[PDB]
mmCIF file of C-alpha atoms and ligand atoms in Angstrom:
data_model
loop_
_atom_site.group_PDB
_atom_site.id
_atom_site.type_symbol
_atom_site.label_atom_id
_atom_site.label_comp_id
_atom_site.label_asym_id
_atom_site.label_seq_id
_atom_site.Cartn_x
_atom_site.Cartn_y
_atom_site.Cartn_z
ATOM 1 C CA UNK A 1 -9.017 -5.164 -29.921
ATOM 2 C CA UNK A 2 -11.991 -6.286 -32.117
ATOM 3 C CA UNK A 3 -11.165 -9.878 -30.958
ATOM 4 C CA UNK A 4 -12.437 -9.153 -27.402
ATOM 5 C CA UNK A 5 -15.663 -10.719 -26.104
ATOM 6 C CA UNK A 6 -18.482 -8.082 -26.576
ATOM 7 C CA UNK A 7 -20.192 -8.720 -23.216
ATOM 8 C CA UNK A 8 -16.835 -8.279 -21.456
ATOM 9 C CA UNK A 9 -16.219 -5.092 -23.527
ATOM 10 C CA UNK A 10 -19.669 -3.831 -22.355
ATOM 11 C CA UNK A 11 -18.804 -4.737 -18.720
ATOM 12 C CA UNK A 12 -15.503 -2.748 -18.687
ATOM 13 C CA UNK A 13 -17.033 0.460 -20.235
ATOM 14 C CA UNK A 14 -17.334 2.280 -16.855
ATOM 15 C CA UNK A 15 -13.583 1.644 -16.216
ATOM 16 C CA UNK A 16 -12.268 2.533 -19.704
ATOM 17 C CA UNK A 17 -10.742 5.984 -20.314
ATOM 18 C CA UNK A 18 -11.223 6.970 -23.979
ATOM 19 C CA UNK A 19 -7.868 7.694 -25.738
ATOM 20 C CA UNK A 20 -8.929 11.353 -26.362
ATOM 21 C CA UNK A 21 -9.414 11.881 -22.576
ATOM 22 C CA UNK A 22 -5.843 11.085 -21.559
ATOM 23 C CA UNK A 23 -2.560 12.927 -22.302
ATOM 24 C CA UNK A 24 0.457 10.689 -21.373
ATOM 25 C CA UNK A 25 3.877 12.323 -21.032
ATOM 26 C CA UNK A 26 5.904 9.277 -22.189
ATOM 27 C CA UNK A 27 9.050 11.459 -21.821
ATOM 28 C CA UNK A 28 8.528 12.131 -18.078
ATOM 29 C CA UNK A 29 8.833 9.193 -15.645
ATOM 30 C CA UNK A 30 7.674 9.327 -12.042
ATOM 31 C CA UNK A 31 10.096 8.291 -9.255
ATOM 32 C CA UNK A 32 13.374 7.984 -11.276
ATOM 33 C CA UNK A 33 12.563 4.462 -12.559
ATOM 34 C CA UNK A 34 12.286 2.959 -9.002
ATOM 35 C CA UNK A 35 8.540 2.473 -9.660
ATOM 36 C CA UNK A 36 8.971 1.038 -13.187
ATOM 37 C CA UNK A 37 7.361 2.371 -16.393
ATOM 38 C CA UNK A 38 5.164 4.986 -14.716
ATOM 39 C CA UNK A 39 4.677 8.414 -16.376
ATOM 40 C CA UNK A 40 3.118 11.786 -15.616
ATOM 41 C CA UNK A 41 -0.247 12.196 -17.279
ATOM 42 C CA UNK A 42 -3.295 14.412 -17.568
ATOM 43 C CA UNK A 43 -6.745 12.914 -17.367
ATOM 44 C CA UNK A 44 -9.741 14.950 -18.569
ATOM 45 C CA UNK A 45 -12.948 14.167 -16.654
ATOM 46 C CA UNK A 46 -16.543 14.641 -18.086
ATOM 47 C CA UNK A 47 -16.518 18.361 -17.045
ATOM 48 C CA UNK A 48 -13.148 18.953 -18.758
ATOM 49 C CA UNK A 49 -11.218 19.319 -15.465
ATOM 50 C CA UNK A 50 -7.510 18.459 -15.811
ATOM 51 C CA UNK A 51 -6.469 15.691 -13.360
ATOM 52 C CA UNK A 52 -2.750 15.034 -12.699
ATOM 53 C CA UNK A 53 -2.254 11.282 -12.842
ATOM 54 C CA UNK A 54 0.405 8.504 -12.738
ATOM 55 C CA UNK A 55 0.207 6.288 -15.845
ATOM 56 C CA UNK A 56 1.607 2.754 -15.742
ATOM 57 C CA UNK A 57 2.273 0.979 -19.051
ATOM 58 C CA UNK A 58 1.646 -2.789 -18.833
ATOM 59 C CA UNK A 59 4.384 -4.339 -21.030
ATOM 60 C CA UNK A 60 3.778 -7.881 -19.566
ATOM 61 C CA UNK A 61 0.423 -8.019 -21.486
ATOM 62 C CA UNK A 62 0.494 -9.251 -25.131
ATOM 63 C CA UNK A 63 -2.171 -11.958 -25.809
ATOM 64 C CA UNK A 64 -6.011 -11.510 -25.783
ATOM 65 C CA UNK A 65 -6.307 -13.858 -22.721
ATOM 66 C CA UNK A 66 -3.953 -11.564 -20.730
ATOM 67 C CA UNK A 67 -5.843 -8.421 -22.015
ATOM 68 C CA UNK A 68 -9.217 -9.951 -20.930
ATOM 69 C CA UNK A 69 -7.935 -10.745 -17.390
ATOM 70 C CA UNK A 70 -6.519 -7.182 -17.128
ATOM 71 C CA UNK A 71 -10.006 -5.793 -18.042
ATOM 72 C CA UNK A 72 -11.492 -7.881 -15.164
ATOM 73 C CA UNK A 73 -8.879 -6.707 -12.620
ATOM 74 C CA UNK A 74 -9.853 -3.143 -13.702
ATOM 75 C CA UNK A 75 -13.591 -3.882 -13.139
ATOM 76 C CA UNK A 76 -12.990 -5.245 -9.582
ATOM 77 C CA UNK A 77 -10.440 -2.582 -8.545
ATOM 78 C CA UNK A 78 -12.848 0.178 -9.762
ATOM 79 C CA UNK A 79 -15.299 -1.001 -7.015
ATOM 80 C CA UNK A 80 -12.647 -0.214 -4.345
ATOM 81 C CA UNK A 81 -12.631 3.413 -3.345
ATOM 82 C CA UNK A 82 -11.929 4.879 0.091
ATOM 83 C CA UNK A 83 -10.043 8.065 1.206
ATOM 84 C CA UNK A 84 -7.167 5.844 2.508
ATOM 85 C CA UNK A 85 -6.871 3.419 -0.379
ATOM 86 C CA UNK A 86 -5.256 4.170 -3.742
ATOM 87 C CA UNK A 87 -8.145 4.467 -6.218
ATOM 88 C CA UNK A 88 -8.084 3.327 -9.814
ATOM 89 C CA UNK A 89 -8.996 6.251 -12.111
ATOM 90 C CA UNK A 90 -9.330 3.924 -15.059
ATOM 91 C CA UNK A 91 -7.665 1.912 -17.779
ATOM 92 C CA UNK A 92 -6.729 2.823 -21.365
ATOM 93 C CA UNK A 93 -6.752 0.339 -24.261
ATOM 94 C CA UNK A 94 0.469 0.152 -27.642
ATOM 95 C CA UNK A 95 0.366 -1.830 -24.334
ATOM 96 C CA UNK A 96 -2.587 -1.341 -21.851
ATOM 97 C CA UNK A 97 -2.371 1.624 -19.443
ATOM 98 C CA UNK A 98 -3.361 1.855 -15.750
ATOM 99 C CA UNK A 99 -4.262 5.398 -14.680
ATOM 100 C CA UNK A 100 -3.847 6.230 -11.001
ATOM 101 C CA UNK A 101 -4.062 9.487 -8.990
ATOM 102 C CA UNK A 102 -0.773 11.339 -8.604
ATOM 103 C CA UNK A 103 0.778 11.052 -5.140
ATOM 104 C CA UNK A 104 2.862 14.220 -4.692
ATOM 105 C CA UNK A 105 4.857 12.916 -1.732
ATOM 106 C CA UNK A 106 5.653 9.408 -3.067
ATOM 107 C CA UNK A 107 5.926 6.400 -0.727
ATOM 108 C CA UNK A 108 5.348 6.810 2.984
ATOM 109 C CA UNK A 109 8.633 5.041 3.993
ATOM 110 C CA UNK A 110 10.827 7.504 2.030
ATOM 111 C CA UNK A 111 8.726 10.457 3.248
ATOM 112 C CA UNK A 112 9.268 9.685 6.951
ATOM 113 C CA UNK A 113 13.016 8.932 6.403
ATOM 114 C CA UNK A 114 13.453 12.267 4.554
ATOM 115 C CA UNK A 115 15.629 14.549 6.763
ATOM 116 C CA UNK A 116 13.974 17.677 5.175
ATOM 117 C CA UNK A 117 10.430 16.694 6.289
ATOM 118 C CA UNK A 118 10.006 16.712 10.065
ATOM 119 C CA UNK A 119 6.774 14.806 10.904
ATOM 120 C CA UNK A 120 5.888 15.043 14.611
ATOM 121 C CA UNK A 121 4.931 12.007 16.801
ATOM 122 C CA UNK A 122 1.254 13.205 16.302
ATOM 123 C CA UNK A 123 1.673 13.257 12.488
ATOM 124 C CA UNK A 124 3.178 9.710 12.504
ATOM 125 C CA UNK A 125 0.344 8.370 14.656
ATOM 126 C CA UNK A 126 -2.077 10.155 12.268
ATOM 127 C CA UNK A 127 -0.438 8.348 9.317
ATOM 128 C CA UNK A 128 -0.861 5.013 11.158
ATOM 129 C CA UNK A 129 -4.523 5.780 11.835
ATOM 130 C CA UNK A 130 -5.072 6.540 8.128
ATOM 131 C CA UNK A 131 -3.504 3.169 7.194
ATOM 132 C CA UNK A 132 -5.685 1.373 9.760
ATOM 133 C CA UNK A 133 -8.768 3.093 8.168
ATOM 134 C CA UNK A 134 -7.786 1.990 4.664
ATOM 135 C CA UNK A 135 -7.142 -1.572 5.902
ATOM 136 C CA UNK A 136 -10.429 -1.607 7.835
ATOM 137 C CA UNK A 137 -12.136 -0.796 4.491
ATOM 138 C CA UNK A 138 -10.155 -3.512 2.608
ATOM 139 C CA UNK A 139 -10.831 -6.156 5.337
ATOM 140 C CA UNK A 140 -14.580 -5.242 5.241
ATOM 141 C CA UNK A 141 -14.492 -6.145 1.483
ATOM 142 C CA UNK A 142 -12.775 -9.478 2.445
ATOM 143 C CA UNK A 143 -9.637 -8.280 0.632
ATOM 144 C CA UNK A 144 -6.271 -9.676 1.961
ATOM 145 C CA UNK A 145 -3.368 -7.371 1.074
ATOM 146 C CA UNK A 146 -0.390 -9.830 1.742
ATOM 147 C CA UNK A 147 2.280 -7.039 1.404
ATOM 148 C CA UNK A 148 1.410 -4.284 3.843
ATOM 149 C CA UNK A 149 4.478 -2.134 4.687
ATOM 150 C CA UNK A 150 5.281 1.612 4.736
ATOM 151 C CA UNK A 151 7.021 1.292 1.343
ATOM 152 C CA UNK A 152 3.605 0.189 -0.060
ATOM 153 C CA UNK A 153 1.585 3.227 1.091
ATOM 154 C CA UNK A 154 1.603 6.498 -0.898
ATOM 155 C CA UNK A 155 1.178 10.074 0.339
ATOM 156 C CA UNK A 156 -0.711 12.770 -1.630
ATOM 157 C CA UNK A 157 -0.539 16.646 -1.673
ATOM 158 C CA UNK A 158 -2.986 16.875 1.270
ATOM 159 C CA UNK A 159 -0.854 14.362 3.308
ATOM 160 C CA UNK A 160 -3.544 11.688 2.901
ATOM 161 C CA UNK A 161 -2.100 8.216 3.085
ATOM 162 C CA UNK A 162 -3.258 5.719 0.467
ATOM 163 C CA UNK A 163 -2.734 1.971 0.952
ATOM 164 C CA UNK A 164 -1.361 0.852 -2.439
ATOM 165 C CA UNK A 165 0.388 -2.198 -3.997
ATOM 166 C CA UNK A 166 -2.845 -4.097 -4.668
ATOM 167 C CA UNK A 167 -4.899 -4.868 -7.777
ATOM 168 C CA UNK A 168 -3.542 -3.147 -10.905
ATOM 169 C CA UNK A 169 -1.227 -1.045 -8.636
ATOM 170 C CA UNK A 170 0.765 -4.269 -7.693
ATOM 171 C CA UNK A 171 4.476 -4.879 -8.624
ATOM 172 C CA UNK A 172 5.143 -1.174 -8.069
ATOM 173 C CA UNK A 173 8.897 -1.684 -7.408
ATOM 174 C CA UNK A 174 9.596 -3.921 -10.466
ATOM 175 C CA UNK A 175 12.522 -2.285 -12.336
ATOM 176 C CA UNK A 176 13.975 -3.365 -15.725
ATOM 177 C CA UNK A 177 17.649 -4.487 -15.953
ATOM 178 C CA UNK A 178 20.138 -4.376 -18.873
ATOM 179 C CA UNK A 179 8.558 -9.515 2.634
ATOM 180 C CA UNK A 180 9.341 -11.994 5.425
ATOM 181 C CA UNK A 181 10.071 -9.269 8.065
ATOM 182 C CA UNK A 182 6.441 -8.015 7.786
ATOM 183 C CA UNK A 183 4.957 -11.551 7.617
ATOM 184 C CA UNK A 184 2.921 -13.202 10.334
ATOM 185 C CA UNK A 185 4.412 -16.294 12.002
ATOM 186 C CA UNK A 186 1.692 -18.609 10.491
ATOM 187 C CA UNK A 187 2.337 -17.113 7.004
ATOM 188 C CA UNK A 188 6.073 -17.818 7.339
ATOM 189 C CA UNK A 189 5.250 -21.400 8.364
ATOM 190 C CA UNK A 190 2.265 -22.233 6.034
ATOM 191 C CA UNK A 191 2.457 -19.579 3.187
ATOM 192 C CA UNK A 192 -1.278 -18.773 3.808
ATOM 193 C CA UNK A 193 -2.459 -15.154 4.298
ATOM 194 C CA UNK A 194 -5.569 -13.793 6.079
ATOM 195 C CA UNK A 195 -6.822 -10.423 7.356
ATOM 196 C CA UNK A 196 -5.207 -11.530 10.705
ATOM 197 C CA UNK A 197 -1.808 -11.845 8.941
ATOM 198 C CA UNK A 198 -2.364 -8.304 7.499
ATOM 199 C CA UNK A 199 -2.885 -7.136 11.133
ATOM 200 C CA UNK A 200 0.608 -8.487 11.980
ATOM 201 C CA UNK A 201 2.078 -6.560 8.985
ATOM 202 C CA UNK A 202 0.184 -3.472 10.155
ATOM 203 C CA UNK A 203 1.916 -3.764 13.546
ATOM 204 C CA UNK A 204 5.299 -3.796 11.726
ATOM 205 C CA UNK A 205 4.212 -0.753 9.638
ATOM 206 C CA UNK A 206 3.307 1.056 12.877
ATOM 207 C CA UNK A 207 6.818 0.295 14.203
ATOM 208 C CA UNK A 208 8.279 1.656 10.898
ATOM 209 C CA UNK A 209 6.273 4.892 11.463
ATOM 210 C CA UNK A 210 7.317 5.381 15.058
ATOM 211 C CA UNK A 211 11.056 4.788 14.189
ATOM 212 C CA UNK A 212 10.794 7.169 11.183
ATOM 213 C CA UNK A 213 11.471 4.321 8.703
ATOM 214 C CA UNK A 214 14.112 2.226 10.495
ATOM 215 C CA UNK A 215 14.509 -1.302 8.949
ATOM 216 C CA UNK A 216 12.878 -3.983 11.189
ATOM 217 C CA UNK A 217 15.196 -6.687 12.745
ATOM 218 C CA UNK A 218 18.360 -5.324 11.095
ATOM 219 C CA UNK A 219 20.632 -7.916 12.786
ATOM 220 C CA UNK A 220 18.373 -10.930 11.912
ATOM 221 C CA UNK A 221 18.730 -12.858 8.608
ATOM 222 C CA UNK A 222 15.404 -13.372 6.723
ATOM 223 C CA UNK A 223 15.983 -17.151 7.156
ATOM 224 C CA UNK A 224 16.237 -16.796 10.966
ATOM 225 C CA UNK A 225 13.068 -14.671 11.454
ATOM 226 C CA UNK A 226 10.828 -17.698 12.029
ATOM 227 C CA UNK A 227 12.928 -19.087 14.950
ATOM 228 C CA UNK A 228 13.545 -15.535 16.279
ATOM 229 C CA UNK A 229 9.725 -15.057 16.515
ATOM 230 C CA UNK A 230 9.152 -18.599 17.958
ATOM 231 C CA UNK A 231 11.626 -17.712 20.738
ATOM 232 C CA UNK A 232 9.190 -14.941 21.697
ATOM 233 C CA UNK A 233 11.417 -12.075 20.527
ATOM 234 C CA UNK A 234 9.691 -8.987 18.950
ATOM 235 C CA UNK A 235 10.496 -5.509 17.629
ATOM 236 C CA UNK A 236 11.206 -3.246 20.633
ATOM 237 C CA UNK A 237 9.339 -0.143 21.729
ATOM 238 C CA UNK A 238 10.644 2.886 19.719
ATOM 239 C CA UNK A 239 12.016 5.858 21.701
ATOM 240 C CA UNK A 240 9.072 8.280 21.447
ATOM 241 C CA UNK A 241 6.233 5.786 20.909
ATOM 242 C CA UNK A 242 3.476 6.187 23.606
ATOM 243 C CA UNK A 243 2.989 3.079 25.773
ATOM 244 C CA UNK A 244 -0.672 2.469 24.649
ATOM 245 C CA UNK A 245 0.398 2.514 21.009
ATOM 246 C CA UNK A 246 3.199 0.009 21.609
ATOM 247 C CA UNK A 247 0.658 -2.210 23.499
ATOM 248 C CA UNK A 248 -1.428 -2.136 20.254
ATOM 249 C CA UNK A 249 1.703 -3.092 18.165
ATOM 250 C CA UNK A 250 2.493 -6.047 20.492
ATOM 251 C CA UNK A 251 -1.137 -7.324 20.207
ATOM 252 C CA UNK A 252 -0.644 -7.354 16.400
ATOM 253 C CA UNK A 253 2.221 -9.838 16.837
ATOM 254 C CA UNK A 254 0.441 -12.392 19.027
ATOM 255 C CA UNK A 255 1.381 -15.891 17.730
ATOM 256 C CA UNK A 256 -2.342 -16.876 17.812
ATOM 257 C CA UNK A 257 -4.056 -15.093 14.836
ATOM 258 C CA UNK A 258 -7.465 -15.120 16.598
ATOM 259 C CA UNK A 259 -5.937 -13.142 19.553
ATOM 260 C CA UNK A 260 -4.822 -10.245 17.322
ATOM 261 C CA UNK A 261 -7.124 -7.148 17.136
ATOM 262 C CA UNK A 262 -9.399 -6.600 14.075
ATOM 263 C CA UNK A 263 -8.736 -3.516 11.912
ATOM 264 C CA UNK A 264 -11.975 -2.053 13.457
ATOM 265 C CA UNK A 265 -10.372 -2.423 16.928
ATOM 266 C CA UNK A 266 -7.145 -0.917 15.594
ATOM 267 C CA UNK A 267 -8.962 2.172 14.148
ATOM 268 C CA UNK A 268 -10.795 2.546 17.503
ATOM 269 C CA UNK A 269 -7.737 2.271 19.724
ATOM 270 C CA UNK A 270 -5.469 4.383 17.543
ATOM 271 C CA UNK A 271 -8.137 7.123 17.014
ATOM 272 C CA UNK A 272 -8.398 7.522 20.811
ATOM 273 C CA UNK A 273 -4.550 7.683 21.160
ATOM 274 C CA UNK A 274 -4.312 10.180 18.275
ATOM 275 C CA UNK A 275 -7.012 12.406 19.889
ATOM 276 C CA UNK A 276 -4.708 12.963 22.970
ATOM 277 C CA UNK A 277 -2.319 15.136 20.857
HETATM 278 O O1 LIG B 1 9.381 11.206 -5.586
HETATM 279 C C1 LIG B 1 8.228 11.021 -5.953
HETATM 280 N N1 LIG B 1 7.288 11.977 -6.297
HETATM 281 C C2 LIG B 1 6.010 11.421 -6.690
HETATM 282 C C3 LIG B 1 6.226 9.936 -6.560
HETATM 283 C C4 LIG B 1 5.628 8.644 -6.705
HETATM 284 C C5 LIG B 1 4.245 8.311 -7.121
HETATM 285 C C6 LIG B 1 3.378 9.289 -7.615
HETATM 286 N N2 LIG B 1 2.111 9.067 -7.994
HETATM 287 C C7 LIG B 1 1.696 7.800 -7.864
HETATM 288 N N3 LIG B 1 0.454 7.334 -8.184
HETATM 289 C C8 LIG B 1 0.413 5.988 -7.908
HETATM 290 C C9 LIG B 1 1.612 5.571 -7.410
HETATM 291 C C10 LIG B 1 1.982 4.175 -6.984
HETATM 292 C C11 LIG B 1 2.306 3.280 -8.160
HETATM 293 C C12 LIG B 1 3.440 3.503 -8.930
HETATM 294 C C13 LIG B 1 3.737 2.681 -10.009
HETATM 295 C C14 LIG B 1 2.901 1.631 -10.333
HETATM 296 C C15 LIG B 1 1.770 1.398 -9.576
HETATM 297 C C16 LIG B 1 1.473 2.219 -8.497
HETATM 298 C C17 LIG B 1 2.454 6.732 -7.379
HETATM 299 C C18 LIG B 1 3.766 7.005 -6.995
HETATM 300 C C19 LIG B 1 6.584 7.717 -6.348
HETATM 301 N N4 LIG B 1 7.723 8.362 -6.005
HETATM 302 C C20 LIG B 1 7.548 9.719 -6.119
#
């Protein structure tokens, strides 16, 4: 750790959590291993308040070059904060640690599929609106997500949705052993991603919400999705989805990227639909 560039060490200071400010429960994993090496933790802020956090150990990092790049990803992610985006609490320099807020209700796809929880049509639309708000913030920062889906959004104790699976919170479902159906047509064809391809994925996430987590295109092979979309076939209107909201979903899947709504338009339209409930 003495081998690190001093100006870079000075630059990461506002992101670094001192070792005496973090208690990691290395004996308690979060999410039964499905989310990788992520543990319960307690972060102590400047006032001494105990913060329940999720602590990811980064085993893929060994060399100083990899450590330096990790410090930089911490610096940039720390500048992203919004009520509907998963915030970085900090990093701890054993392997490097990523400290994230604890999300009591786990991923949004499992939450809505959960037979115990009974979200209403209003609640599901409200979750979609929160995702559109988080994406509107990311798109305003010129950030392209590339993997937007309900499985990649977390839900906290106040039922606030947080867009996740970006920055140091990426590779969240990478488990140790002993997304073409959300992709825009141009991304399937050219492998290039834009905010307009995130809008297409958002439309698929909205369909996931309104079907309470049904898998999209269950009878279509991932290879055949491209031709299926070029034929002009699309995900159908879910049973209790209001017509104006499905019109918004369909606009997200327009084959011409420039014809799709912006996330600002999506927040606008969905907020007005949500307000009817
Ligand atoms: O059944 C569950 N109860 C809580 C929970 C979580 C949970 C809790 N807190 C969290 N904080 C940040 C994340 C996402 C994340 C996880 C691993 C790596 C990178 C990012 C996260 C996920 C996942 N499943 C379940």
